[PDB]
């Protein structure tokens, strides 16, 4: 709602302020990455 205005019922996030004293905006989840990587070669090791 918007009161004392002639443009009311504005829907969605405005551009002004989502802080409102809220600590943070938490969105948990997970990743899953398949990566080409050269640094995990445990193979070319010298003797001794």
């Amino acid at each position: 709602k918007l009161t004392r205005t002639r443009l009311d019922r504005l829907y969605g996030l405005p551009a002004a302020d989502p802080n409102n004293g809220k600590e943070y905006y938490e969105i948990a989840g997970r990743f899953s990455l398949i990566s080409l990587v050269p640094s995990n070669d445990d193979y070319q090791t010298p003797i001794a």
Partner: protein
């Protein structure tokens, strides 16, 4: 006689160690070079256009 000098030159095989140790001490750089690669994997990239 001289056969004994032949035998004696046979016997002194305990200084050839010194002979080779001198040459290996005054030898060149020693290498621990080591590689051992085996099968490949024939993998790559499959991007969409």
């Amino acid at each position: 006689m001289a056969s004994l000098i032949y035998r004696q030159l046979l016997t002194n095989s305990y200084t050839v160690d010194l002979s080779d140790e001198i040459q290996e001490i005054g030898s060149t750089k020693s290498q621990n070079v080591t590689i051992n690669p085996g099968p490949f994997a024939q993998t790559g990239y499959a991007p969409v256009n």
